[PDB]
Structure 1
Amino acid sequence: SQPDPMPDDLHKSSEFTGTMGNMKYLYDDHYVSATKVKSVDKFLAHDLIYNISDKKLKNYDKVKTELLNEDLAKKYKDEVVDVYGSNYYVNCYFSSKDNVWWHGKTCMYGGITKHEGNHFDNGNLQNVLVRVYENKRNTISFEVQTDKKSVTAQELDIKARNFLINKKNLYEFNSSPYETGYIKFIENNGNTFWYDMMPAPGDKFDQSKYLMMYNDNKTVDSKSVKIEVHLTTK
């Protein structure tokens, strides 16, 4: 259980001088989602490939998800699963070793949950509350919904940030109205953990490497988990 961050543990948007659009892009109504699927291929040992087609546009029919190591991949390799995460295209690589070089491809990290046993009845959705703090005062709270009993932290993070882009301009094209932000998860068993919401300093943003934190395929219990988003303004 990691200590909460101090202001020196946190990326400042004011030190990022590239395009904050490339961070907004990963969160702004952007996700791969699939229900009741099974992996069809592998590229490297720690990854799995699924046949999932893009809904919104037609940017992909194949998705590769990378996990921590080969053991984690073997756990899920033959399993019927659901998928939810944030995908990227720059530096996304994988042989389809069939050529099939004419098929759209996309990549992501973790996002995998066993399907059987993980769903509610008759289309019911579990709410998860997100409380937001700006400059160390509660401002608003909102709910996000998921269809999973055990849900990746990644799915919830994406839903939380999507809402905040639209409600709070969390990320804009050029910069952010916030200087720092982290999203903090609190499990009923007392375990906490957090993700920095701001890009590393400098004039470039590496989407793949930012998303790689979802590597661990970390799941929380939707019924009981708590979430806080902590922001300071510019």
Structure 2
Amino acid sequence: QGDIGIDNLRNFYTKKDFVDLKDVKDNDTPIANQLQFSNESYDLISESKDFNKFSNFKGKKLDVFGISYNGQSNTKYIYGGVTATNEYLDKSRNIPINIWINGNHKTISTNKVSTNKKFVTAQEIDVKLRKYLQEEYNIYGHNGTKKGEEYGHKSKFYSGFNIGKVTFHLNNNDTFSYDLFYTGDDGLPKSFLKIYEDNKTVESEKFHLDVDISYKA
């Protein structure tokens, strides 16, 4: 009856704790499309369509960041999220953001959207960004504060917004974008998180974000 994608976007992007593993050794299985990181409670399984990258990462110490969802028994899944552990930046870089809210542009940078990775996954930046947008603009509704109240509750999220895009602007002239309100075919994380299966990375010092949020009735 309902759209499970609404609660799932809000939960998985803004309430559930992100995966944040540093310098963890992959288990080096024969599985071509997965890396696997074991701990005392569960195994985290990363899936990617970049088999060549994953082959190179087999048995290496790696960083993992993003959104996980439940697997059978003591397993959890994440799409991509994996980076190498060869070099880092000397400190956290806050990613510069150009943001348009109902067509009105401003700029912001925040400790809440930052990385010290030399190459960071687009996933890590995106999930941090959406958590921040929920905090500041209540984009998915029910953020639990008064921040973003000025935009109303007209959308099916009980928010002011139902259209939005994050655009990664590379030093290039290249870009790529994700839809902030994409719920996949069924509103389930196995579907909507699949956008991260390329394990796309960006050079952290050499990109910025353009963000757009709006409403259409």
TM-score by length of 2: 0.82
- Residue aligning to 2:65: 84
- Residue aligning to 1:126: 93
Output one character per residue of 1:124-157: Cα deviation in whole Å (capped at 9) or x when no partner: 2112112221222214523322121111111000
- Residue aligning to 1:106: 76
Greater shift after overlay, 172-181 or 141-150?
172-181
Output one character per residue of 1:32-88: Cα deviation in whole Å (capped at 9) or x when no partner: 1111111115484201110257xxxxxx53200001143232111122211111111
- Residue aligning to 1:142: 109
Identify if the C-alpha distance between structure 1 residues 126 and 228 changes in structure 2 by more than 3 Å, giving closer, same or farther.
same
Identify if the C-alpha distance between structure 1 residues 182 and 32 changes in structure 2 by more than 3 Å, giving closer, same or farther.
same
Describe the SS at the equivalent of 1:170. Answer: coil
- Measured in 1, the distance between the counterparts of 2:166 and 2:189 equals 18
1:152 is aligned to 2:152: no
Q: Give the unaligned 5+ runs of structure 1.
A: 1-15, 54-59, 94-100
The percent of aligned pairs where both chains have the same amino acid is: 28
- Residue aligning to 1:116: 86
Identify if the C-alpha distance between structure 1 residues 211 and 85 changes in structure 2 by more than 3 Å, giving closer, same or farther.
same
- Measured in 1, the distance between the counterparts of 2:203 and 2:47 equals 22
Higher relative contact order (CA 8 A, sep 6+): 1
* Contact 2:79/2:197 (8 A) holds in 1: yes
- Residue aligning to 2:147: none
The counterpart of 1:219, out of the listed 194, 197, 201, is 201
* Contact 1:84/1:155 (8 A) holds in 2: yes
**RMSD (CA atoms):** 2.3
Amino acid at match of 1:214: Y
- Measured in 2, the distance between the counterparts of 1:43 and 1:105 equals 18
TM-score by length of 1: 0.76
- Residue aligning to 2:13: 27
* Contact 2:66/2:123 (8 A) holds in 1: yes
- Measured in 1, the distance between the counterparts of 2:191 and 2:184 equals 14
- Residue aligning to 2:52: 71
